[PDB]
Structures are given as structure tokens and as C-alpha cells.
Amino acid sequence: KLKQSDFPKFEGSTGGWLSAAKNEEKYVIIWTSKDASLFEMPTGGTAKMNAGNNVAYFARKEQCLALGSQLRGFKITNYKIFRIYPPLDITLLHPFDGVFPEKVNQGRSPVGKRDASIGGNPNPASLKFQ
Amino acid sequence: SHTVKIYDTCIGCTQCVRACPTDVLEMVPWDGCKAGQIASAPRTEDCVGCKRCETACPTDFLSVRVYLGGETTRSLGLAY
Amino acid sequence: FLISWRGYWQELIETIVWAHERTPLANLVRWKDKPVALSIVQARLVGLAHFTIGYVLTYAAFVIASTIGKLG
Amino acid sequence: KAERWNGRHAMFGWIVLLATGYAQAHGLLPEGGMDAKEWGTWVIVSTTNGEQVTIPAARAAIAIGHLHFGAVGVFAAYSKNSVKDRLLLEPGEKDEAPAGLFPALRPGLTKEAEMLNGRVAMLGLVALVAVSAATGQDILSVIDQGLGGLLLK
Amino acid sequence: LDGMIGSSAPFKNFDPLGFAAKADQKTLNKYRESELKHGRVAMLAVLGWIVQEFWHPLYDGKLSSNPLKALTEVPLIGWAQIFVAINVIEYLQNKIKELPGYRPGDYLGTWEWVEQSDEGWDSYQTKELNNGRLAMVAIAGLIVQDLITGQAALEQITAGNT
Amino acid sequence: VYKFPKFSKALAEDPSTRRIWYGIATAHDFESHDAMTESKLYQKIFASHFGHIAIIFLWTAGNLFHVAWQGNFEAWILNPLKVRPIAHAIWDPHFGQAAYKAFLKTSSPANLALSGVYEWWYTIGMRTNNDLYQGSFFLILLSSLLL
Amino acid sequence: MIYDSQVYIALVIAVVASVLAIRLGATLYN
Amino acid sequence: AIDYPTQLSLFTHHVWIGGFCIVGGAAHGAIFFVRDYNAANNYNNLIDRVIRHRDAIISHLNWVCIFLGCHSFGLYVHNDTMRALGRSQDLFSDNAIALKPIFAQFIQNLHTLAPGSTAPNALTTVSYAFGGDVISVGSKIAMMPISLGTADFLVHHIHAFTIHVTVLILLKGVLYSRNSRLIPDKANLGFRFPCDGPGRGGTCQVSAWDHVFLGLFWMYNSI
Amino acid sequence: VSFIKPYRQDPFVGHLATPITTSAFTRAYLKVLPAYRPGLTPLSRGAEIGFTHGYFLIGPFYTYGPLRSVEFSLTSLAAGLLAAITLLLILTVGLSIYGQVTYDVYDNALIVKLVRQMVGSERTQDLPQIKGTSELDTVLGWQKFSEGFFSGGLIGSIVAAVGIALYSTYL
Amino acid sequence: MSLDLLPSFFVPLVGLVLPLFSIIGLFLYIEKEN
Amino acid sequence: IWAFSLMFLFSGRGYWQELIESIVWAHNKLKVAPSIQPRALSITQGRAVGVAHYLLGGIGTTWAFFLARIISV
């Protein structure tokens, strides 16, 4: 019926990925579920989970993350999202250090932090021709 | 890709991180507030510019600021 | 261009993109630039340009034709 | 490449000018003007007082012949993979080397011969236009004078 | 006369003359193709016969409502186009016949979706076959009656030439 | 999808049609262009000013030439209160016979001139279709100077 | 009425102004 | 029938009420999809299967809307530009290229022949609009055969085009009320929200309410 | 039974296996078309497409043009033929520029294998990537396709004009 | 060639040929790569 | 009213909020700023006001036109 046994029991929708997620990048979300719960696809309609390993492919990181946020309502937490380039170039994305970004984990450095409030930003006229 | 900056007015309430739809922001250790945490933007290449992050900011004039910049298929939200 | 804003035109463009990508005899032709809806500022500019050009053209036509046809 | 193509066209057009002079002299080249009722108002040239002067039918026929030749050229242009000599240079191809002041004196059906004859024909067209503009006669009148009278006879 | 679709209650596996008891699978596929084509053509022919009899809007009226008479009144250049269209359709059907998993009368390729056919699918195929058979008998009767009597269906019925 | 917004690398990397749209609308915002200095800014503005004045002079020369060639300036001189000035002739293949007849003025369909150039040029002392031609020639020369 | 020579030389001078325009256009860079 | 103000007012009022109520029905369908729609309870049913191929529906409805608008309105514009160019024989008129509504005239003929043939117990047609005699009360016309020509063809196709575009806006609102390729979690933002932000190139009016707003505009146009 | 299933057993594609996308009739009909017919060089595909397209393109121009005639007119036929030929020229120009800006390949179905085997550590998009393996997806292939479209369009327009004249005269 | 033939020579030339070549050049330029 | 609608349909909330800022400054300068802080209409409410005014104006214009025309003749 389906290419892989771990795919959710989805009947296919004309809202899945397109030619872009065959030559630029595609995103895969994996998770393990205790029950074959019925959930709503980020793209189309209702799909059925597998009582075990579940693997879904999407065209955007936002679609995978919306599916994962929906999974949290099913008490599912072990979901992990990967980015796949045109060949099998798998990169773990969402649980980047194994801890969700909302929980503080040691080993993270601040990126994009300014040691002042908004009012300390430089005047644009002094940022001309650089 | 858009630019996201975090300012030391951060109170570490995590509402920005749990509102990001593309996993751009994360909470990192800090010593400038009671919570001991500050938001970070290490994955701005996935930033879409929806500005949900600063809609959930409780600080007075924001501690996370999104500056829209060059566009990308990821930042434009293109599924095609 | 002024009343209808973006977001409503991005999803429609996505539907058109799917239709083009999933139809035979036209799959042979594909765009190089991904078709997207006009940006918010661009949409405001285009609506303003249409408004102004239509305004100027209709009033020029009216004033000229009315003067010519009324005063011989 | 451009010089060679323009020389070929100039030689062919010297032939065409001779043919046009012959046709005008020998009772060919249809008479009158185009039918505005048949071909719309775009063929009307002027309305002096109640009569519509239209484009001459001879001009229309000559334009149709030139359209035939130009269409042949356009086909050859969009037929690059099947023609012996292309119109434009391929990426990588390098322009043949300029012939110089005097191309090599190689008689026959040689590149130098065609090159020299194309240059001569283009110079002849330049001289013909210059003579017509300076003196003030028709192009065919200048060709007739330059052939003694054997063309418009 | 097999586990083939088309066996109905009045006469199950109706092969009184034993045409299928000796034929192989290829000949039986040919027989099913012929039966289905005849049935479809006959359904179209019966519907056209009746509708033409009581409605012929095309050709600015004219084209006498009696069939087998309008057959010799069509401009004969519209006959050629109908012939060519039928020919192109059957060329496409021939091309279909070499597709893998082809079934005798299946030009929609339902074998792609229908694996482990149900009873509803078999019943609908039998419905199509039975309607085609009834239409074959009906069109044969129509043509024969119009030949011997000269009146069309609703004309002969209306007068009472029964 | 590259090399069109030569002045902006951020736009040239846009994979969408937005790059083409924004390439048009940011072409004259020289201060926002990539690898930009003040000297280049003023020099480019100076050259653009020269091209603009050339465009203005070419436009005026075209008006003069079309009044001299297809107008009725000389006829309008002798009867300025009854003769309607003509801007330029019309050649449109889509015209019917009725449109040709209605727009017909003297020898060819033409547009009445609503710019008031006839009165302006008459006031400053122009009486011949050869005076207008001289002005067009001189203005094209000035445009060449500015370019 | 202007002559053919008058219009022709004005067209030729206009061509020269065109070559000067592309030179300015190309000098203002791609 | 002879009180023309009453007839005109009644028709216009009832058509306006109908258009408003139809837009409201579309709005509340979208509201149901956002709020009261349960994905689990609707596994592989009609609602699920419609959402699963919403792209195809919306794309083909888009093509139909473009086709109908191009044709109807551009035939109007072609008539306008042919008249402006003095080419009266190139119009889409009765004395020119003619588009006779033959299907509607056939129906009109069928109704005026119904009494005695298909409605044998009828003495007169249901309405004189389909054909018959001119009915006048006090020298004022009550009803009369409404002839259909090329002018009615164009305006009827204009009606079809406007109705199709209104249906397009409202159906796009209903089907894309829960999710899309832009916003995969649009249902979490509710039925009524202004946007998701300036990102993704701009996500104005992606709601389903903003579709009942545009559909209200187009219903006004159509009515 | 169900007549709609996920396309090629992939429930995540933006496509469906309906009785129209993947029906045997659709398969055969699209496989007999010049764009997908097996055994055709790109020049042959272009020639057939151009012939058919010019043949049906001369129709609307001749019938409804600015120089129509309820009777047969040589001027109307010439006008329609010229309009059809110029439209084919415009379409050929579009094809040429599209092929110029789209592909950089001269022999496909190999370069993909070469870069999947012998590595493609270059600027990519020419060695790697490469969408489609058809011969129409090359610079040479599309050029011959456009040439065939243009020549076949001219020939088909002329043939259709001749047929129209014969039908209007002898019928 | 009279002066009144210049409109019929130039208006089609400009208003049709110049768009075609300009579109060709602009499309080629804006679709270039690096 | 139909033309009035276009103010809400064409404009945006930020401009009106920033104008209300200066109006509130004047009120505070005169000690008459209301306790209920004045805010510009929300984006959705701005759209709703625009569409309601547009519909009212257009339908009323057609209403008056139809009624006057068909009552006069």
C-alpha cells in the first residue's frame, strides 16, 4: 500500500511536497507513538499514526514543526526533525542538542545578543556607506 | 535571511522560543536576569519573519527584534 | 491592489504552482524564478500607481472632451 | 562574421536592385495602389481632397519579395544546428581573423574571394547612396546612369 | 463460462453452445473484448436511435427523423470525421492493450486500483455487460423492424404496427 | 536569477520573482547599492542629471519636429482664432474607415495640440515650418552635447 | 513643408545622439 | 406587475438579501472548519477527502474564473474598442458576430409549448416571459416575452463569472481555513486574525475571515 | 474498491493517483503524443508539434481576423497565414530564449551518473543537480526542438492554408 | 519614397520590432547567472 | 459613505495609532486624556468597518438611483 511500513496511514494529499523537495531540500520528522492515534496532517487531512516508529516527509521545516507541536498534544515528545539535501545529506535540526530550545541546556552560547537595550542602537546617519 | 537580535532587557520568560514556528530561537544560560537564561538566535537561516517571537515578548520595548533582510526560499516560506 | 492584501494571493499562487507542476505537456516548461505574490510595500505602490494613472487619465479625458464638445 | 554576412547580403542586394530595375523597365511591377477597402486604413498614405492616396501596389509586391528573403534569413537564424554557416558566434568560437586592408588574392570560391566581393559590394552600395543623395536622382536612375542605359531600356 | 464477470441469475455461465469450454484464455479475452465493444456500441446506438427519432436539433432540422434514412443524408464529410475519430479512439485502445496488467474490456486501467475486486465492482461490471447485451438485442430489433416495416421505433409504436 | 540587480547582492540571491520587481524599484536608490561610496554617488547623480537634461531636450526637439512636419503651424499663423493646431499625425492599423474619416485633418488623421506650443512659439517669433526644424536640429545638437 | 533631405539629416543626427546615449548608458554601468 | 417601483424594489432587495446570506453561509462554514472540525471524527469521509485535494479544486476554479472573466469582460472590451475604432461590423452584436443563447431559447420554446403538450391540463404558460401574448393592465405592461439575444449572452456569462469568483474566494477561505503551505498551523490562529506577520513575503489576510471580507466585496460586485 | 490512492505509494507527494492522472487511457494517450512518444529525436518532436500547432493556429486568424470574408478571399487567407507564421516566430523566439536561459548540457542521462559516481565537487547546477534526463533537457536538444517547431509550424500553416482554400473552392 | 510613407515604415517598426528585441534582451539579461 | 470606506480599506493601523499618539499628547497637555486609553481600531475591525461602509455606500447609491428612476418614470 505504502512505500515504507513506518509511514503514517495517510491516503495522500495534493498538498505535499513538490519538485522543490527533490532538488533543493526536504524535511523528515520521525517519532514513536504508543497508540495508532488519528492526527491531522500539516498539509492535507487526517492520517493515522503507527503504534511504533512513524516517519513523515515534508517540504518545509515549519510544516514538520507544526506536526511536532501537534504531537505534543498526544503526549509525544521524542519527535525529531531532519533536513535532507538533494542527496541523502541528513542533518538533525529541531532537537539540536537533544534538549528542546525552550529548556536551557549547558553548552549553548548566545547568538545575536546585544549588551544594551533598543535605545542604544546607533543612529542610521552614522551607518552610511559601509 | 532575516536578522534577529536579542537585547539584555531579556527576562528569560521563554515565550519567544516557544512561539517560533521554525525553531530559530533557543534559551541559553545567562547571568543578567533572575531566570538565569537569555534567548538566542543561532538558526536565523530558518527565520521566516512572521514576528511571532516579538508578539510574545513581555518586556517594554521588546528584547527580541526581527530585522527583515534578504529573502530566501526558506525565509519566503515557499513549499515549492 | 489596495483593498485585497497579500497572503490571499500567495496561497492562490501556490495553487497555480501546483497546477502547473502537476499537468502534462506543461511540465516540460518550468520557471527559473519562483512565482510569489507581490510584497506588501510593492502592492501598495502598484495600487497607488493604478489609482493615480486612472485618476489622471480619466480627468484629462473628461476636461479635454468636455471643453471641446461644449465650446465648439 | 558580421562583415561577411553583410557582404553576402550586399551582393545579393545588388542582384536584387538589378532585378528591380529590369522589372520596372520591362512592364512588370504592378500598377496602381493598394485597395483600402480590402486591406484596411493602414494602407492609406494621405487624403488630399476627397481621394485616398494608398501605398503603391508595386511597393507592396517588392515588400512581399523582401519578406520572402527575410523569412528565409530568419529560418536560417533559428536553424543554427543545421546550417553550414551560422549567423552568430557560439560561446567559445572566436571571430575569424580580420582580413586586413587587402584580403589575400585567392581566386575562386574561397573565403578571401567572398570577403573581397562583399566588401566591394558594400562599398558600391555606399557610393550609390552617396551619389543619389548628392546629385538628387532616384537610386534606379543612378544605377541606370552607371550602366550607360542598359538597365532602364 | 469461467470465473469471469458477467454471470447473472437467469442463466449462470451462459454457454449453451460451448464456445468457451474449449477456448484458451487468449480467445476468451478476445470474446470478452468483442462482447463489451458490441454492448457499448449498441447502447450508444439505441440511445441515438430513440433521441434522433424525437429530437434532431443539428443540421438545421432536416435529416429525417427515421434512422437508416438520415444515414444517407449526413454530408458524408461529417461521416468521415466520425470514422476518423472512432479510428483514433481504437488506435488508442490498441495502445492501451499492451500496457502491463491489461484486462480485456478495461480501457480505464482499473486494474491499477482494483486489486482483490469486491462484489460491488463485479456486480457493476455485470450490470454494464447485461445492459450492453440488452442493447445489442434492442438495436438488432430496431434495425430489422425499420428495414421490414419502414417506420421508426416511436413511429411504429405510436401507430400500432405491432 | 542572478546578475540583474548588479547593485544589490541581497536581491540577486532571491530565488523568487520578487528580485525582478525590486530590481526595478531600487535602481535609482544609489545610496543603498552594494559597494557604495559618496564620491561615486555624486558622480553617478551628476551623469544621470546630464542624461535627464538630454532627455528633456530630445523631447522638446521631437515636439518641434512633429509640429514642423505633420502640424499646420503655417496655416495657423494666418488664422489663429479659427484654425485648430495639430500636434502630430496618426498611423494606427486598427482604425476603421469611420475613425480615419473622423480623425482626418487636412492630409492625414492627426491629433489636435493641447500643449499650447503653437501660441508659445508664435509669440517668441516663429513663422515658418523651417524655423521649427532649425529648433529641433539645435535641440538634438544640445542633447548630444549633454550626453 | 519640409523636404526629404531635411528629415533625413535630422534622422541621421538623431542616430548620432542615440550612439551618444548608449555610451552614456553603458558608462553608467550595467 | 404594473407597479414598476414595487417590482424593481422587491427583486433588488431579495437578491441583495440572498447574496448576503450566501456569504454568511460561506463564513460560517469557514468558522465550523476552524473551530468545530474534528480531524479524528472525519477520517477519510467527504470533508477529509475535500481538504486532501483542495489544491486541485482551487486551481481549477481559478482557471475557470480566469477563462470566464477573460471571455465575458474581454468581449465587452472588444465591443467597446471596435465601436471606438469605427468598426461596427467587428462587434459581438446581433448585426455582427452573433452569440445567440440557443440553449436558453430552446428552453423558452419548450415552456411556451408546454400547455397542451407536456402540461396538457394547463391553459397557459407558467410565465409570459417564456413567450406568448403581451399582458397589459390599464395600458401598462404586466408581463411580456423576454427576448434573449447576444446582449443577454454576454451579461449572463458576466453573472456566471462573478458568481464563480465569489465562490472561489469563499471556497478558498473555507478549505484553507485550517492550514496551508504558508501557515501549516492556521487553525491555531483562529477564524478571525489579521495575519501571521510580514514574513514569508507578507502574510496579510490569510484568515478565513479575510476571505469573507473579500467575498463580500465580490458579492457586492456580482449582485 | 477505491479509485484514488497515493501516487506511487508515497503519501507525502503533492499528487494523487486518480482515474485521470494514472489511467491506462491517460498513459497511452500521453505516450502517443509527440512530446512523450518513444523513438523520436527532439527535432522530430519539435517538427510534429509545430506542424499541428501551425495547422490549428491558422484557423482563428483566418476566420476571425481583421480581413475576414464570408466568401473565400485570397487576401483573407494570406492575412491569416502571415499572422499564424508571425505568431509561430514569436513562439520560436520564446522557445529559443527559454532554452538559452534554462539548460547548460549537451548530452544528458550521463552527466548525472558521472557526478553520482565520479563526484561533483564543482560549482554545481551543471555537473550536479540537472533536472530531467530527457534529450529535450539539453542546450542542443532544446535548440533542435525549437528549430523543428519553427520549420514544422511554417509547413503546417502552409498545408492548412492549402486545405482551407481547397475546401472553400471545391466544396 | 515620399515623406508620407515614413509613418507606415516606422510605426510598425518601432511599436512591434523594438518591443520584441527589447524583451529578448531584457529577459536574457535578467535571467543570467554568475 | 462609499468614499469614506476607502479610508479604512486603503490605510493601516500604525498611522492612525501614531496620530492618536499626538492627539493624546494634546489631551494630556490639557489634562483631559481619558482613563480608557484611546487605541486605533484593530486590523480586523478596520477591515470590517471598511467593508461595511463600502457595502452601505454602494447599496445605498444603487437604492436611491433605482428608486428615484423607477418612481419618476
Ligand code: CLA
Ligand atoms: C453509435 C452511436 C451513434 C451514431 C452512429 C449516431 C449517428 C448520428 N446521429 Mg446520433 N446520438 C447518439 C449516438 C449515435 N448517433 C446518442 C447516444 C445520442 C444521445 C445524446 C445521439 C443524439 C443525436 C442527436 C440529438 C442528433 C444525432 C444525429 C445523428 C446523425 C448525424 C450525426 C450527428 O450530428 O451526431 C450527433 C451526435 C450527438 C450530438 C451525440 C453523440 C455522442 C456520442 C455518441 C458519445 C461520445 C462518443 C465518443 C466520441 C466516443 C466514445 C468514447 C469511449 C466510449 C471510447 C447520425 C446519423 C443528428 C441528426 O441528424 O438526427 C437525425 C442529431 O440532431 N444524434
Ligand code: CLA
Ligand atoms: C476593474 C477592476 C478589477 C478587475 C479588472 C479585476 C480582475 C480580476 N479579479 Mg478582482 N478585485 C477588484 C477589482 C478588479 N478585479 C477589487 C476592487 C477587489 C477588492 C475586493 C478585487 C478582489 C479580487 C479577489 C479577492 C479575487 C479577484 C480575482 C480577479 C480575477 C478573476 C479572473 C479573471 O477574470 O481574470 C481575467 C482578467 C480580466 C477579466 C481582466 C481584463 C483582461 C482583459 C479583458 C483580457 C486580456 C487583455 C490582454 C491580456 C491585454 C494585453 C495587452 C497588454 C499587455 C498591453 C481578475 C484578474 C480573483 C482571482 O485571483 O482570479 C481568479 C480573486 O480571487 N479580485
Ligand code: CLA
Ligand atoms: C477574451 C476576450 C476576447 C476575445 C475572445 C476576442 C476575440 C477577437 N478579437 Mg479581440 N480584443 C479584446 C478581447 C477579446 N477579443 C480586448 C480586451 C481588446 C482590447 C485590447 C481587443 C482588441 C482587438 C482588436 C484591436 C482586434 C481584435 C480582433 C479579434 C478577433 C480576432 C482575434 C484573433 O486573431 O484571434 C486569434 C486567436 C487565436 C490565436 C486562438 C485563441 C483561441 C483558441 C481557439 C483557444 C482554444 C482552446 C481549446 C479549445 C483548448 C482545448 C484544446 C483541446 C485539444 C484539449 C476575435 C473575434 C480583431 C478583429 O478585427 O476581429 C473582428 C482585431 O483587429 N481584438
Ligand code: CLA
Ligand atoms: C522624445 C521625442 C519624441 C517622441 C515622443 C516622438 C513620438 C513619435 N514619433 Mg518621432 N521623432 C523625434 C522625436 C520624438 N518622436 C525626432 C527628434 C525625430 C527626428 C529624427 C522624429 C522623427 C520621426 C519620424 C520620421 C516618425 C516619427 C513618428 C513618431 C510616432 C510613432 C513612434 C515612432 O515611429 O517613432 C520613430 C522615431 C524616430 C525614428 C526618431 C527617434 C525619436 C527620438 C530621436 C528618440 C527619443 C528617445 C526618447 C528620448 C527616450 C527613448 C526611450 C527608449 C530607451 C525606450 C510618435 C508619435 C512616426 C510618425 O509620425 O507616425 C505617425 C514617424 O514616421 N518620429
Ligand code: CLA
Ligand atoms: C505600435 C503597436 C502596434 C502596431 C503597429 C500593431 C499593428 C497591427 N495589429 Mg496590433 N496590437 C498591439 C500593438 C500594435 N499592433 C497591442 C499592444 C495589442 C494588444 C492590446 C494588439 C492587438 C491586436 C489584435 C487583437 C489584432 C491586431 C492586429 C494588428 C494589425 C492590424 C490589422 C490589419 O489590417 O492587418 C492585417 C494583418 C495582416 C494582413 C498580417 C499581419 C501579420 C504580421 C503582423 C506581419 C508581420 C510581418 C513580419 C515582418 C514577418 C516576419 C518574418 C516571418 C515570416 C518569419 C497590424 C499588423 C490585427 C491583426 O491583423 O491580427 C494579426 C488583430 O486581430 N493587434
Ligand SMILES: CCCCCCCC(=O)OCC(=C\C=C\C(C)=C\C=C\C=C(C)\C=C\C=C(/C)C=C=C1C(C)(C)C[C@H](OC(C)=O)C[C@@]1(C)O)/C=C/[C@@]12O[C@]1(C)C[C@@H](O)CC2(C)C
Ligand atoms: C524583391 C524582388 C523584386 C522583383 C520585383 C517584382 C517581384 C515581386 O514582386 O516579388 C514578390 C513576389 C514573389 C517573391 C517571391 C520570392 C522572393 C521567393 C523567394 C524564395 C526564397 C527561397 C525559397 C530561398 C531559399 C533559400 C535557402 C534554402 C537558403 C539556403 C541555404 C543554402 C542554400 C546555402 C543551403 C544551406 O544548407 C544547410 C547546410 O542547411 C542552408 C542555407 C539556409 O544556408 C510576388 C509578388 C506579386 O505576387 C504578388 C505579391 C502580387 C501579384 O499581384 C504581383 C506579383 C506577382 C508581383
Ligand SMILES: CC(/C=C/C=C(C)/C=C/[C@@]12O[C@]1(C)C[C@@H](O)CC2(C)C)=C\C=C\C=C(C)\C=C\C=C(C)\C=C\[C@@]12O[C@]1(C)C[C@@H](O)CC2(C)C
Ligand atoms: C553594411 C553596409 C551595406 C549593407 C547592405 C546590405 C546588407 C544590402 C541590402 C540589400 O539587399 C537588401 C537587403 C535588399 C535590396 O533590395 C536592397 C539592398 C540594400 C541592396 C554598408 C556599410 C558601410 C560601412 C562603412 C562605410 C563604414 C565605415 C567606417 C569607418 C570609416 C570607420 C572608421 C573608424 O573605425 C576607424 C577606421 C577607427 C575608429 O577608432 C574610428 C572610426 C572613425 C569609427
Ligand SMILES: CC(/C=C/C=C(C)/C=C/[C@@]12O[C@]1(C)C[C@@H](O)CC2(C)C)=C\C=C\C=C(C)\C=C\C=C(C)\C=C\[C@@]12O[C@]1(C)C[C@@H](O)CC2(C)C
Ligand atoms: C560584388 C557585387 C555583386 C555580387 C553579386 C553576386 C556575388 C551574386 C551572386 C548570385 O548568387 C546570387 C546572389 C543570386 C543568383 O541568382 C545570381 C548570382 C549571380 C549567381 C557588386 C559590387 C558592386 C560594386 C560597386 C558598384 C563598386 C563601386 C565602387 C565605386 C563607385 C568606387 C569608387 C572609388 O574607386 C574610385 C572611383 C576612386 C577611389 O579612390 C575611391 C572610391 C570611392 C573607392
Ligand SMILES: CC1=C(C/C=C(\C)CCC[C@H](C)CCC[C@H](C)CCCC(C)C)C(=O)c2ccccc2C1=O
Ligand atoms: C480612521 C481610521 C482609524 C481610527 C478610527 C477610529 C479611532 C474610530 C473612531 C470612532 C468614534 C470614536 C466613534 C464613532 C463616531 C461616529 C460619529 C458614530 C457613527 C455614526 C452613526 C450614525 C453610526 C483606525 O483605527 C483604522 C484602523 C485600521 C485601518 C484603518 C483605520 C482608519 O482609517
